[PDB]
Design a protein around this ligand. Structure first.
Ligand SMILES: [K+]
Ligand SMILES: [K+]
Ligand SMILES: [K+]
Ligand SMILES: [K+]
Ligand SMILES: [Mn+2]
Ligand SMILES: [Mn+2]
Ligand SMILES: [Mn+2]
Ligand SMILES: [Mn+2]
Lengths: 491, 512, 517, 517
């Protein structure tokens, strides 16, 4: 068959593994959304169009670099490239915009560190943007610079040498960095965020629930809608994951920083744990950093990078991301393309049998009519190999709860809320459709055309063929919060 | 707790995932054996000693390069470094030596980097006269029939698939092409022709000479390149000759056809190497993982070693720290079920050979503790067919007994490793300490996850019963000495009712 | 908690067993329907009213005894008792009426001098079974006449013949030119015209006599709801019954009774064609060794369950009560295990037709069934059904399963379905929701037949259809709730799943909604 | 295949149920041991021989009746019948002897010059419950004398008294000064000296009268092997029994009978202290509502299974056979479900002590148990036990589980264990191998007590020890095999798991070996 159906029907995971078939072509829209970081290499309107076709879902603005004006152009160009296919509402692909916070980053200033040499922190001199650095490093203490390559030992002795450039990483383990999760800058940044209507915030170095309360606050009332994604970048964040989660809209497994703050051998446990948990919680999780680095420079990924992406997806990740691969490398589109291609395969390899079982089995009872509908809708879909679940949603919550259970059928989410449509990419397998029509006199009719719109757009992009069954999820009255109906229709 | 015990006790895989704890230190010998490739960077006796300390179990000799003499030194140095710790039998680590076959390779026609422009014109000559005359527009190539198999609109890849050539004028003197993916070309690099039915045989006159060399110098294992079908290994066994029935044959799966005929290849090989390198060119990059996952699954089910290889840690050929992906690569290989993981450029030529070995060690230990044994043992028991081989019966009893008392180890007496191999099939968490008189057996056993071989030197006792006991005692002692076993641990001990192989049938529970 | 909820939440069956709590009161309409057999003891209209209150869902007419007239009173009385509560539509309980076919009886003769006389067959004495037409009547201490000619042809030298409800037994020691020269194995008192069973040996006699045919016609005439068809041995045997049933009776459900080795052996093919199965332990417990029935019973139920077709457990579930006011320790467990096995219906024969404790017996089955119903490890059971029922593209099935899943998620008190033939109700019950299936229908007959499905509670809707189809649907749902409140299936604050369709007429169920009371 | 092997290999319980095959003959010694109660009908040496052949493993002496002398003959005859086959050590079957305590019972009194005579407590009539010593012998239709002085002090107005298997029932409505004036609720034939129970009212009677104590001592003198201890309500109740038992009886196994609500409620604590459990359905089925026993039965068995301790299912499993040669459909399923529930032993009371079919009864349990034994879904059951039994560091337990795993892998015919107290055998059986546990011991007593464990088949070894310990072990193993061939547990070509220890004397089992026959 296709979509690894023989593997999907195995009675055990081992069996399932044993039936994975390289000639079994994927046959299903990829559901893992791709976040690409905007930079010199991917800023041009025209470059942006190409990245949208290759499958970019979310543009990441990295406030670790660039100016306010510099990023507004970034935002402006994304919006232009995106509005260039508004030609055709059935085909039009929304693209989220995510501000990625600078936070307690410690960086160098504007030569080779000789292992053994005496090297000061205020070839041998390193200026740091953290003045309190000399309040938090005791004697016999370690300081890591530029992606953990350069090691220093506090006056400091170099323990690991390395080539150093301008303005690069600083990480201080062991010591608890009183440096605040939110500088005066971050605050200004987040305000910029609200002004330009970013959709998502990726919040650097979150160490505790307060850290997000901070962000929400700074975000202001003009930004209740914005989703907040807490980036876990160090030992403490990991340790207090639960609490962070409870309060964040979802998580970013920030492997970069993390891979320095804690020993490299351990990330995978962190990554696997965190995704597991977000999955259980029903909240977006992003896997990030270095998934495809070699491509910053080469047109083909290395054998490890490939398996990285697949394992991220198999792990359970809602989104996968690219940094240098898209912001600066010589192969931005090719990189997007590859994640697309890999994600589809891994998506078809997911052992839904075990996965759906386990989620049902661990999600607690519930009395929210929306949740009740979702799970029934998901069960119904599996029973008839439905091609899609089509939901009418006003904030995405309804789409989000369906995706929680990981249907194999696509969630086609129909909404009037441009913003909701953009944010919904954070949820695996949700395909948003932006509805433009003015409401019908009769509420019932207005529902129908929305469902119809959903099918139609559905046919058009190849999610649905004549003869397929589709599950349709609606509510008993207008306005959000009342999803409570599930119907089975044939195309 | 430690060794991710809270995760180990979960009722589900999801739950298990959720309980994975970064502060839970591993606390167990690493089981996944490491194969390190020998090159300029790792040939010095003293380098070799260091690599043994950091955890090298198996040395790969790559017959794609170097001369017979060149490899005999390789072998001679390994053996030396290894015999340097025979000072103390309790501590001594054997090391396998693996000959890796050249096979139907195709290579380009020295510190010289011709750049093959994007959207230019390339000629592939196979003409003696141009056996080196390979500039901006010319590449020679040691496979004549390249001109014969590659049709117009066919693909020709060069050097790890990074360079791309589409044929578009098949004419009198050779292959006129166009450069799709351009790039920097080097002296003598791999060539791949997907879609083409490269008529070259799995076993050249060279491979045959190579394998004979293998037998003469007593290599322990053959990694057999480009195996496409059962016959291909029959070839190898043949060439290997009678002086080499003992040698383990590991088929490398390097292309679409091998994958397609995996079952038949497996049934005949002693194990499998998932050759991601070539495989990552022959089939689309997006797909390897399915292959890798499938083949490991299958070898697991079958009970036969499987190797994950190539590009697990490349960035380290050049940098002292792995990239985020390479790390998870290694973990997932082990989590996938791999018996061995390997290193190529990372050890043969890179600037960080030992650091590389160290890392794999460090990662493998964590992933080893992350293995959901509850689901895994259940599924193996449940798919392995009944059996009437007393050795298999004992093994599974022994593996069950071990889980029941969190035994620190199973100690087996073995003459060919078969008994150890059957214990590891089931993936005990306890270590398999394998005591043998067969130097070779002790080497080959590294191909089995979680088997720790001990080479017994003493002359046999007058009383066979006594001779067994000392062997067991020898097992314990060495065991205490390397920190596999502490006083108060329980240990499962597996022996047989009479001397000579094939009669393992007894399992005993002892306290240290 | 109640309804053995702690046991319901266990992670394994063993665990589950361990958390069974005797102080955890059931709290849920019993789902296992009860079939009570009508005889002298339970024929009076007033007796029938009492049995309806105690929980009778199905009345069995046994055509092995009584005349056409005799059964028409039977039917007339039932209907009368039942129509006596039509006073209140919210409360009204329909009752099925099931004809139980006679089929290939094999009978001894009239007894020397009497239809009322008895003879005693002493253990170890010399005994003659003849097929000699003359002694059809002259039977005694050493002789029994049988109305199956071929007997002196089908029983080997050393075979066994079971007489009178399996209580007398004979071993053929010599084959005779006039009758099988046997030895008495099990002694006993022998009556006029009693039953024979012949295990091992094949019996060719037809599954449908001239009588059965007349009976089934009588069936159609009086509008029975269900036929329990005795000795079904093969698919043809039901085709026979359908046929005989005639066109005036396509509606009738046909329940094949498996009463011997061969039926068991051909169970699959019988099932494929029957509307469900009756595990006939009586005959069965004689045609095949007594040790074995359980495997049969357990097999058949498993299989029906898998198949989504009603299965009845029957015979001797409570016999001591034909005579005593309390069941023995075994009978009790029998009932529970039947329910636990997966049974859709459980039945009573002597216990209701003739015994001194008809109502008490019905009461007991009620009481036990409720307890077992709560002990069902739904967690494993729903998992296993989902996992083995094949994909499906019937919108009704799809809706059913989603409806069932939705219910578990909010401990819904009920699923309320609108159904025209019961199909939609039947599919929900297939999956064994713990919530009740309140089925609303205009088809008096459908409401009766639906009791064959575990946990389906039928409501007969009487109102003339509304001008607006949508409105008519709503009142039906409302009617479902209201009746639901009224009998204690639903309280204010409960959640309820409602299952309807997108247009009138059967076959189009395809909508599931979540409502709060 | 046989032994329901296709069912055994199913992937789910549903599936397993579906594949149960009535033509799949069992092929395996039956494992569930049978306890038969000794009475008039089963006391004769010769009768006892027959009962041994039919499969009796444990003789129950019921100290609720008979005298010390009367029971010593009981014992003396059992031992005789049993020693009659010592002719051949390979085939010799040991037989446990179990003393069943009287405890806090409460009987009505003897009847008006009537021994085997009866009287009817008419429904609705006027009945007086006395304690007047003078009325002890004057039982009648209007008067019932009870041996419980304090009855008058505990049964308040509108309190309930029930007599003889709970069939007779009395409503106290009047407190007089010489007795309790009761209304009869459930009328009926009353006999002499029949049981009384008092639900709702706590009974200040002690678990151990001066009699019980004398009884227990008698027990130790005559070397009974097991004590079934009536009405155990709490841990203390067993401490009592142990105590009374004295030091001359540390070896005796104590089986606590759970006979009422409180025992149930405090099961855990009773278990922790008893050697095993008897689910006393009789009393229990009166103390608590009949609908609930099954939960209790199922709970207790589950829990003893989890604990590793014998559990007995008892009372009324086969009553109809006290009087008839064939069991009713429920009794049969009762036995099978008891076995499928997880019971280690099943028992017969009236069926063997007094009825007209003692041996036939034993035979039937045998026959049923074999079938149910092969129906056990080992796949789920062994998984669940591994998964719930806690880690352990006892080398004996470790070896047992390995041995049990090994056996499953090769469909071993048997695990053969050398055991001194049976503890090694008991641990193997805990995991419920499908292979038989052939237990070889020199301890006649151990060999007798081991029947309390499912699927343990004890062999008594008679030879004087060999000079060389190693050789002595081997002959014991050899003895095991040989005896095993001889009774059909093992055939040439089978695999057998053999479990031994590293040194003599109990407590050191720690070795497992795989041998081919
Ligand atoms: K940042
Ligand atoms: K090679
Ligand atoms: K009949
Ligand atoms: K007693
Ligand atoms: Mn960061
Ligand atoms: Mn290769
Ligand atoms: Mn019948
Ligand atoms: Mn009692």
């Amino acid at each position: 068959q296709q979509q690894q159906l023989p593997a999907a029907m195995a009675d055990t995971f081992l069996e399932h593994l044993c039936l994975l078939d390289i000639d079994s072509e994927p046959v299903a829209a990829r559901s893992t959304s791709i976040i690409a970081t905007i930079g010199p290499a991917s800023r041009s309107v025209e470059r942006l169009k190409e990245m949208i076709k290759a499958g970019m879902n979310i543009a990441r603005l990295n406030f670790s670099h660039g100016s306010h004006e510099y990023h507004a152009e970034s935002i402006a160009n994304v919006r232009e490239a995106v509005e260039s296919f508004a030609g055709s509402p059935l085909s039009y692909r929304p693209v989220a915009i995510a501000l990625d916070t600078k936070g307690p980053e410690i960086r160098t200033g504007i030569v080779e560190l000789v292992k053994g040499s005496q090297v000061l922190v205020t070839a041998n001199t390193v200026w740091v943007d953290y003045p309190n650095i000399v309040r938090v490093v005791p004697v016999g203490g370690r300081i890591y610079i530029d992606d953990g390559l350069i090691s220093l030992v506090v006056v400091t002795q170099v323990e690991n040498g390395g080539v150093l450039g301008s303005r690069k990483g600083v990480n201080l383990p062991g010591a608890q960095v009183d440096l605040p999760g939110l500088s005066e800058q971050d605050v200004r940044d987040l305000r910029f965020g609200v002004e330009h209507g970013v959709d998502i915030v990726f919040a650097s170095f979150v160490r505790k629930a307060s850290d997000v309360a901070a962000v929400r606050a700074a975000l202001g009332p003009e930004g209740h809608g914005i989703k907040i994604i807490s980036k876990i970048e160090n030992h403490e964040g990991v340790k207090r994951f639960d609490e962070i989660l409870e309060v964040s809209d979802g998580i970013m497994v920030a492997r970069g920083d993390l891979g320095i703050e804690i020993p490299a051998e351990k990330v995978f446990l962190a990554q696997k744990m965190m995704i597991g948990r977000c999955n259980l919680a029903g909240k977006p999780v992003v896997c990030a950093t270095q998934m495809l680095e070699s491509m910053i420079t080469k047109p083909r990924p290395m054998r490890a990078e490939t398996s990285d992406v697949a394992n991220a997806v198999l792990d359970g990740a809602d989104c996968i991301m690219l940094s240098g691969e898209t912001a600066k490398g010589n192969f931005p589109v090719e990189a997007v393309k590859m994640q697309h291609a890999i994600a589809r395969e891994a998506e078809a390899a997911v052992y839904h049998r075990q996965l759906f079982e386990e989620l049902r089995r661990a999600a607690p009872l519930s009395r929210d009519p929306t949740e009740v509908t979702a799970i029934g809708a998901v069960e119904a879909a599996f029973k008839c190999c439905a091609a899609a679940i089509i939901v009418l949603t006003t904030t995405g919550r309804s789409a989000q709860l369906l995706s929680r259970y990981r249907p194999r059928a696509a969630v086609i989410a129909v909404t009037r809320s441009a913003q909701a449509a953009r944010q919904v990419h954070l949820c695996r397998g949700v395909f948003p459709l932006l509805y433009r029509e003015p409401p019908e006199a009769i509420w019932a009719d207005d529902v129908d055309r929305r469902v119809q719109f959903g099918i139609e757009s559905g046919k058009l992009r190849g999610f649905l063929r004549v003869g397929d069954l589709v599950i349709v999820v609606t509510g008993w009255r207008p306005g959000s919060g009342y999803t409570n109906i599930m119907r089975v229709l044939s195309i």
